[PDB]
């Protein structure tokens, strides 16, 4: 029995009360049989009719706890995100300890038990409705995931502290454990973990492991099979985003600029075909090696889409990503790169825990010019030069219509000003 | 004894996100946190508490020491009117144009209500583990008004010192003259020992003014802003009402630190201003440069 | 013995040829296993190396699947295939369905594979199962039966099923056999024993032509859940709708919220989505709900709490539609054959109110033609005289079917009746706010409108006002009752309680 | 012996979705189409061929019968341009100067000619079903289409033989064939013309051809429009005059409006003369009371609603240049009045010139699409813009 956390209703609020609607004879019979199974297993309790509180209840039974969720202390939000496959350092062994009814296992304190009520009607109108309460952690309650996560963190403390080498990632219910130990020793450790979590009250799958659009392989992380499909444009942009992590050079600009349902534009077919051509090839990404250093790259797959590639050893990519310069206002190419650079450093600090050494097309003189003439103070941590086909700079070199006469003397849709600039340069 | 200090009526609790930090920083923060837990000053919080305050790490003069400065703006803003009324420390007039504390705060107990509000969280790299979170069971270092609960004990013993020499008066915004600075250094050393006992040109003329363009009352909005018209030009403006008066990021932040101190001296409050550098870009490097508990409004 | 439709490639396009990317052995076991079973069934047959056509296979295992399953991306053959007729995207609306004593649901099994394929296009549907270490060329296969994912496979199956059902439908007139994508929904007015005999007879006929049928016990129970509608015997109800209560709303989440609200608008009256949709004006980005928007969400939830049911169409009576103005720019309509029982309920979302009424009548009659086939006997808020006034004066043709007036608090009316004739015993005013008058008192679209307004209040009850901007003329002549714009609201407000006001345009000279 | 039919080079087939129809229309279409399939003019098709052209059902002659008007305009735009130069159809200028012109329907005779097997697929009609209960029955034309341009082209060789004796017997009668309609024009009196019309009908029935609505040419003259001469001058009237004079300036140059403008003299009471200004008005009155037709360009007929049961039609080849202008006085529902106006405009254009004008109909798209079929009695279907959204009307 995990130590029960104190849960307090929101001050100035009272327990929820909702009416119940009857259902079909087969449905209610199945539901009451399910409840009988729970009671014989002691899973739920039968609250008295004296309790004023109520909550709607609808073989899967769904409880709309939104009324109870209206009155509950805010709980700490579970850390939102996906452990990026690149951040996983290579472990000689891997496991999955999929736990069943993990949310169900957590108990609930006495005060908040009464505020959860369930009214399942009775056939022949013997009772207006059978009244129940959850003695376990309810589904969909605001605090169900956070309380469970904190309880798990407390529950695994004896095992993780003793062993520093073993690394255990926790996500939702499941537990992901990596060991550098041999298969024999690891069998002992996995048995200890299983018996320990069973001691506190809480058929294995086989490699390879695929999850959350992230196919995982010992020396390589590759996305799930990506196939290109208003909602169609939504799906098309969404698929390219998840494919942009490992398939370098994915272009999404034309769709974002594009968005009765209009069809794909004339150039949309060709751009989607280019994306499909890049998608055809199988690409993958290596898990980062702690001993060596992270290196970053920057290149232009297309204007408005600065693509960057974090690589540990050349020609092998740890990850690839896109920065959308076209989204938002058009700026100086060096400024576009600065925006991209900040994007890269945020990703680098969250995923790997360190800043990378950036190899960028912008020349050292050009970056120095950007520093000299700009109003913001944005800075790039590490500057290295790499030759790439697209190399960009600034044009000016640092309603007054006579400016056009001066030029004669020597939106992304408009380029007549660019012709004027070509005459200027 | 313990004096209750509360949030303003109809005010929600303090909740802000922890900007992810580098690994070298998190190592030092976790080691200092576990040390403090061994001392007993900080204790864990369950999932019941909804308050989260940001934790950043700073090192002073390459001393190989990093400190757990906690951005207390939100909770301090929430109880700001409360700490001022219960205890007042107006900034002295002599300090303007004049011709350390907080270590003992660890001994002070804290009331239940504010203790539960001050909750700091250490991050996790790549979401390896749900981040450890704590609560301050002793006096925090960074709450405006945190000195006030323990202010009486220090000033009551600082007064005998001030009895011998009236030249120096000290304001306590957070836990942190006429006498010749060398002689004042001698006096400061003796005071430290005492603490040990305690425990076109015409157009340019018009252009110059255009180039410039581009007493304290508690009810005044005194704003000090640091602007750099490029690396070459730096514009240092302070204002009360509108129209009325090297790493680039490091320069901006250090100048901001200095002007925040200047505003604290003259007006007893940290100025409220917006950074010219992009706030995301600022956040990438804000942690390195500030070296005091004082936190600008941003 | 089903006949094979003549299917050909698009003229001038060679047969597509694709190469399979390597795949891990654990997959290459399940795929070869399922292929061997298919060969036994006759659905797939081996192809010799002479055929030059090959397509890619990507193996996918669904959630809670023990064995990895086969997916063939026939997109290359889809790009190159004779265009086929498109199956009707619309599904039968429950309201149109007449009540019959017994309705039984039959689902044919492996429907695509029961249909045979033309000999010509059997060859093009060929793929190479992946090979490991290049030890063998790899097993290569072609589909005798229709492929799933092909462009025209649903159309060919639809034609096959339609032709198979024609002998049964001709022989039995009472039975109505709706056809969904893969199921036959059968209904008769006969007694349930005779009906059961008829359904088993249909099963035997379909099996004679090679399409499997569900067992008598396995046929679905009387309450049916289909495409978001629960079709109870004497009522149709939209499936239980749950509204998320999350504090921060993703743009995707707001889209889903609007989708669910529109889904439940067909049976739940007065669901307002215009404000939420206005808030929808990065997909992850969150928007703070206006106080108006959260009030709208709250009243929507209040409606959603109670259960509502609609009734199936009965042929004898006559459909009657009543339009009610829920709000400015929003209209709510109910289609009821008998009072207090609604076949369906709809919402029209949007400048004169009677013009919007005309648009709403058009939408209602289009929907009624699609579903029931007869335009309703409309019941509308506006009175007869105002409708006659709008018909004779409007610039564009307007027609409304037979309409009988009903009295509701929010009647549809024109707030001001402008003057096209100059009025005697009145002062004429010229407006640039010029406010020039016959007395001589004196003082870009916004300027032209606001000058007219300032003249209106300055003028008094009766006046003649001239302006050179057709924008102002259009604003006034349109007679907006919505008054969405504050300036426009000012002009409209001043125009209301006046005996006569004449607006005119002077050509520039 | 099927005449070769081919699409215009590089042209795709018809793919147009069928509008939903009232239940009675669908039942009538089902019965008529079943009889036609039994006879053999049409036959069912499967999903192999993805071609569709719309079907509509119209009542005829105010009689208890339902006639089918397949909208073959899209297939016309593709094949008729190819066939008109290939086969051709002359236009007689004498039809517009006859005393009386009648119209007859020669549709039934088109049911005998067979159609090339290659072009059969491009003509397919789908009869829709209510509530999407069943896939719509799809048929195709195995017999010469009725109401498709080029049916007169193919049947012209037979028709010239059919009408040769009647033309040889009577030189005065003048005949033109356009989309199943035969136009008989004569300078004889009404009683004289009707007997010969009966003669031609009997002649058609003698040869096996199976086959009213008299239009009187030379009874139509372009209506001049003159602003009324004011017995007493009125300022509001003067402003209306100057606006209409500018509009007429766009139509006909040379009008001088300044004289009325000077009389306005800035600020005056809206309710309240110079001889020279009067003289200007008289000369402009007579003046108000390009003309040649480019065969390649397509006529556009613009309809303006003056209200109170009156409509005005301007048939013009190019904007601002009007080939004919008239006012349709109307005896109801606005849709029926617009439909009668459209039919009269088209039938008047056909006599004067070959083409049927493209219509700028003043009605919202949904209302026209929903209500046009019931009030329509003419086999030909004009090409129309469903709506001109802005009023686009000067003061009038
Ligand atoms: N489904 C599922 C699933 C399985 C394992 C996961 C995972 O594993 C580790 C867990 C803990 C430490 C290292 C880990 O792995 C790094 C190295 N590594 C990576 C992959 C493989 S297959 N083997 C291997 O050694 C971390 C995060 C999510 C996981 C999800
Ligand atoms: N995001 C998202 C998403 C999810 C499902 C999709 C999909 O499935 C169904 C679509 C319709 C009915 C059943 C389906 O299947 C079970 C539902 N289900 C759920 C999760 C997963 S990962 N897969 C899956 O199939 C078809 C097409 C796109 C889909 C997108
Ligand atoms: N899942 C599923 C499912 C089940 C039936 C459907 C359906 O049924 C009919 C099919 C044919 C005639 C009438 C029908 O139903 C009218 C209304 N109705 C409804 C229920 C009862 S018990 N009786 C009754 O009359 C039509 C369309 C889709 C369907 C989907
Ligand atoms: N196209 C499509 C599509 C999308 C979701 C479907 C669906 O939801 C899931 C139910 C359970 C797990 C995952 C689900 O889907 C992924 C996440 N998710 C959840 C809810 C919604 S509305 N959309 C969504 O993407 C169940 C069955 C069919 C679905 C089809």
CB C78 within 8 A of CB C85: no
Tell me which ligand sits closest to the C-alpha of residue A231. 4
From residue C243, alpha-carbon distances to A56, A362, C199, C257, C305 in Å are 13, 50, 40, 7, 10
CB A324 within 8 A of CB A251: no
User: Are the Cβ atoms of C373 and D130 closer than 8 angstroms?
Assistant: yes
**Ligand 1 in reach of A209 Cβ (< 6 A):** yes
**Residue C107 and residue C200 share a domain:** yes
- Comparing CA positions, the residue from A199, A1, A37, A36 lying closest to residue A109 is A1
Instruction: Collect all residues from B whose CB is shorter than 8 A from any CB in A.
Output: 13, 15, 20-23, 26, 46-50, 52, 124-131, 133, 228-232, 247-249, 251-252, 276-278, 280-281, 284-285
The rounded distance, in Å, linking the Cα atoms of A244 and C179 is: 42
To which residue do tokens 């200092």 refer? B32
From residue D6, alpha-carbon distances to D15, D53, D82, D110, D143 in Å are 17, 17, 8, 19, 16
**Residue B28 and residue B158 share a domain:** yes
Write the DSSP symbol of residue A303: T
The rounded distance, in Å, linking the Cα atoms of D380 and D338 is: 16
Helix axes of B279-289 and A333-351: crossing angle, nearest 10 degrees: 50
Residue nearest to atom 3 of ligand 1 (CA): A209
Tell me which ligand sits closest to the C-alpha of residue C263. 4
All residues of chain B having their beta carbon less than 8 Å from the beta carbon of residue A150 are 46-47, 130
**Residue D307 and residue D250 share a domain:** no
- Comparing CA positions, the residue from A86, A35, A87 lying closest to residue A57 is A35
**Residue B224 and residue B194 share a domain:** no
Domain's final residue, options D288, D311, D330: D288
User: Are the Cβ atoms of B20 and A377 closer than 8 angstroms?
Assistant: no
**Residue B117 and residue B234 share a domain:** no
Is C448 known to sit in a ligand binding site? yes
Report the residue count for chain C: 509
**Residue C280 and residue C252 share a domain:** yes
| Structural domain includes residue D273 | yes
CB A119 within 8 A of CB A130: yes
The rounded distance, in Å, linking the Cα atoms of D114 and D108 is: 13
What is the widest separation between alpha-carbon atoms in chain A? 98
**Residue A305 and residue A274 share a domain:** no
From residue A248, alpha-carbon distances to A83, A278, A315, B44, C25 in Å are 20, 8, 12, 44, 27
Q: Do chains C and A touch (3 or more CB pairs under 8 A)?
A: yes
Tokens standing for residue C53: 């056509």
- The alpha carbon of A142 is separated from its chain's Cα centroid by a whole number of angstroms, namely 19
**Ligand 1 in reach of A94 Cβ (< 6 A):** yes
For residue A263, give the CATH number of its domain: 3.30.70.270
User: Are the Cβ atoms of A87 and B125 closer than 8 angstroms?
Assistant: yes
Q: Which domain holds residue C288?
A: 236-305
| Structural domain includes residue C5 | no
The rounded distance, in Å, linking the Cα atoms of D216 and D95 is: 10
Nearest-by-CA chain C residue for A65: C245
The rounded distance, in Å, linking the Cα atoms of A370 and A331 is: 12
The rounded distance, in Å, linking the Cα atoms of C92 and D52 is: 22
Do the bridges between strand C377-380 and strand C320-327 make them parallel or antiparallel, or are there none, so unpaired? Answer: parallel
Name the residue of C100, C173, C311 to mutate for ligand 3: max ligand atoms within 8 A of Cβ. Answer: C100
Tokens standing for residue C218: 């396995």
For residue C466, give the CATH number of its domain: 3.30.420.10
Name the residue of C94, C102, C187 to mutate for ligand 3: max ligand atoms within 8 A of Cβ. Answer: C187
From residue D208, alpha-carbon distances to A211, D102, D108 in Å are 78, 21, 10
* Beta partners for residue D40, in sequence order: none
Domain's final residue, options C305, C328, C345: C305
Question: Could you tell me the distance, in angstroms and rounded to a whole number, from the CA of residue C152 to the centre of ligand 3?
Answer: 28
Tell me which ligand sits closest to the C-alpha of residue C311. 3
Of C26, C60, C283, the CB nearest to A225: C60
**Ligand 1 in reach of A9 Cβ (< 6 A):** no
The rounded distance, in Å, linking the Cα atoms of A8 and A10 is: 6
From residue D67, alpha-carbon distances to C45, C353, C505, D127, D346 in Å are 52, 39, 50, 14, 20
Question: Could you tell me the distance, in angstroms and rounded to a whole number, from the CA of residue A231 to the centre of ligand 2?
Answer: 14
Name the residue of C90, C91, C94, C97 to mutate for ligand 3: max ligand atoms within 8 A of Cβ. Answer: C97
Instruction: Name the 3-class secondary structure at A256.
Output: helix
All residues of chain A having their beta carbon less than 8 Å from the beta carbon of residue B13 are 74
10 Å CB burial of residue D382 (0-12, 13-18, 19+) is: middle
To which residue do tokens 């980062």 refer? A288
Q: CA-based angle D385:D386:D392, to the nearest 5?
A: 75
Question: Could you tell me the distance, in angstroms and rounded to a whole number, from the CA of residue D370 to the centre of ligand 3?
Answer: 29
Count of other CB atoms within 10 angstroms of residue A98:
13
Experimental technique behind these coordinates: cryo-EM
* Beta partners for residue B68, in sequence order: B57
| Structural domain includes residue A300 | yes
Count of other CB atoms within 10 angstroms of residue C12:
6
Tokens standing for residue B86: 């219960």
CB B68 within 8 A of CB B57: yes
The strand order across the sheet containing A214-217 reads A209-211, A214-217, A220-223
| Structural domain includes residue C476 | yes
Question: Could you tell me the distance, in angstroms and rounded to a whole number, from the CA of residue A310 to the centre of ligand 1?
Answer: 20
Of A58, A62, A225, the CB nearest to C58: A225
All residues of chain A having their beta carbon less than 8 Å from the beta carbon of residue B20 are 346, 349-350
Name the residue of C189, C221, C224 to mutate for ligand 3: max ligand atoms within 8 A of Cβ. Answer: C224
Test mutation, D21, D48, D137, chain C, max C CBs within 10 A: D48
**Residue A318 and residue A356 share a domain:** yes
Tokens standing for residue D106: 């020669």
Question: Could you tell me the distance, in angstroms and rounded to a whole number, from the CA of residue C62 to the centre of ligand 2?
Answer: 9
From residue A295, alpha-carbon distances to A168, A221, A349 in Å are 27, 18, 13
Nearest-by-CA chain D residue for C466: D270
Helix (H) or strand (E) holding C204: helix C192-208
| Structural domain includes residue B158 | yes
Domain count within chain A: 2
Do the bridges between strand C344-349 and strand C330-336 make them parallel or antiparallel, or are there none, so unpaired? Answer: antiparallel
Residue nearest to atom 10 of ligand 3 (CA): C185
**Ligand 3 in reach of C97 Cβ (< 6 A):** yes
All residues of chain A having their beta carbon less than 8 Å from the beta carbon of residue B130 are 78-79, 149-150, 153, 170
To which residue do tokens 């020039």 refer? C436
**Residue A268 and residue A300 share a domain:** no
**Ligand 3 in reach of C182 Cβ (< 6 A):** no
User: Are the Cβ atoms of A377 and B281 closer than 8 angstroms?
Assistant: yes
Tell me which ligand sits closest to the C-alpha of residue C61. 2
Phi (first) and psi of residue D182, to 5 degrees:
-110, 125
**Residue C499 and residue C456 share a domain:** yes
User: Are the Cβ atoms of B251 and A377 closer than 8 angstroms?
Assistant: yes
**Residue C186 and residue C108 share a domain:** yes
* Beta partners for residue A358, in sequence order: A296, A383
Of B22, B46, B228, the CB nearest to A353: B22
- Per DSSP, the residues of A102-152 read HHHHSB--HHHHTT--EEE--GGGSSS-EEEEESBPPTT-TTHHHHHHHHH
| Structural domain includes residue C360 | yes
Helix (H) or strand (E) holding C276: helix C274-279
Test mutation, A280, A283, A322, A323, chain C, max C CBs within 10 A: A280
**Residue C281 and residue C179 share a domain:** no
| Structural domain includes residue C139 | no
The rounded distance, in Å, linking the Cα atoms of D181 and A141 is: 76
Report the residue count for chain D: 396
The rounded distance, in Å, linking the Cα atoms of C451 and C467 is: 9
Tokens standing for residue C345: 């309920």
* Beta partners for residue C98, in sequence order: C313
10 Å CB burial of residue A234 (0-12, 13-18, 19+) is: middle
The rounded distance, in Å, linking the Cα atoms of A93 and C459 is: 90
Question: Could you tell me the distance, in angstroms and rounded to a whole number, from the CA of residue D275 to the centre of ligand 3?
Answer: 84
Tell me which ligand sits closest to the C-alpha of residue A94. 1
**Ligand 1 in reach of A91 Cβ (< 6 A):** yes
Is B103 known to sit in a ligand binding site? no
User: Are the Cβ atoms of A8 and B48 closer than 8 angstroms?
Assistant: yes
Name C114's Cβ contacts closer than 8 Å, sequence gap at least 6.
Answer: C2, C108, C145, C210, C211, C212
- Comparing CA positions, the residue from C220, C217, C188, C181 lying closest to residue C202 is C188
* Nearest-CA distance C245 → chain A (Å): 7
Count of other CB atoms within 10 angstroms of residue D263:
16
Domain's final residue, options A231, A246, A280: A280
Write the DSSP symbol of residue B106: G
| Structural domain includes residue D7 | no
Helix (H) or strand (E) holding D328: strand D324-329
From residue C252, alpha-carbon distances to C257, C264, D81, D90 in Å are 9, 19, 50, 63
Chain A and chain B share a number of CB contacts under 8 A equal to 110
Is A173 known to sit in a ligand binding site? yes
As a whole number of Å, the end-to-end CA separation of chain C is 84
């Amino acid at each position: 029995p995990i130590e029960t956390v104190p849960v307090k209703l929101k001050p100035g609020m009272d327990g929820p009360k909702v009416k119940q609607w009857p259902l079909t004879e087969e449905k209610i019979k199945a539901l009451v049989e399910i409840c009988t199974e729970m009671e014989k297993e002691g899973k739920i309790s039968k609250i008295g009719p004296e309790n004023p509180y109520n909550t709607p209840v609808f073989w899967r039974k769904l409880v709309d706890f939104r009324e109870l969720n209206k009155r509950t202390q805010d709980f700490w939000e579970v850390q939102l995100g996906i452990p990026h496959p690149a951040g996983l350092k290579k472990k000689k062994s891997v496991t999955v300890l999929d736990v069943g009814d993990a949310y169900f296992s957590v108990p609930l304190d006495e005060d908040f038990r009464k505020y959860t009520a369930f009214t399942i009607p009775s056939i022949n109108n013997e009772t207006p409705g059978i009244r129940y309460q959850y003695n376990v952690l309810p589904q969909g309650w605001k605090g169900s995931p956070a309380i469970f996560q904190s309880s798990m963190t407390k529950i695994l403390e004896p095992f993780k502290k003793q062993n520093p080498d073993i690394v255990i990632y926790q996500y939702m219910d499941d537990l992901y454990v990596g060991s550098d130990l041999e298969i024999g020793q690891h069998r002992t450790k996995i048995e200890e973990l299983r018996q320990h979590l069973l001691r506190w009250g809480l058929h294995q799958k086989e490699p390879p492991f695929l999850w959350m659009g992230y196919e995982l392989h010992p020396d390589k992380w590759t996305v799930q099979p990506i196939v290109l499909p208003v909602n169609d444009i939504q799906k098309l942009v969404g698929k390219l985003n998840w494919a942009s992590q490992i398939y370098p050079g994915i272009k999404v600009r034309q769709l974002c600029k594009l968005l009765e349902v209009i069809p794909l534009t004339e150039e949309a077919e060709l751009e989607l075909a280019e994306n499909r051509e890049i998608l055809k090839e199988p690409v993958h990404g290596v898990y980062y090696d702690p001993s060596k250093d992270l290196i970053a790259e920057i290149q232009k797959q297309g204007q408005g889409q600065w693509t960057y590639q974090i690589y540990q050893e050349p020609f092998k990519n740890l990850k690839t990503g896109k920065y959308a310069r076209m989204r938002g206002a058009h700026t100086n190419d060096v400024k576009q790169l600065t925006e991209a650079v900040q994007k890269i450093t945020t990703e680098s600090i969250v995923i790997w825990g360190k800043t990378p050494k950036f190899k960028l097309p912008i020349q050292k003189e050009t970056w120095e010019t950007w520093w000299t003439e700009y109003w913001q103070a944005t800075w790039i941590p590490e500057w290295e030069f790499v030759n790439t086909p697209p190399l960009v700079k600034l044009w000016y070199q640092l309603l007054q219509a006579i400016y056009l006469a001066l030029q004669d003397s020597g939106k992304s849709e408009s380029e007549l000003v660019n012709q004027i600039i070509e005459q200027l340069i």
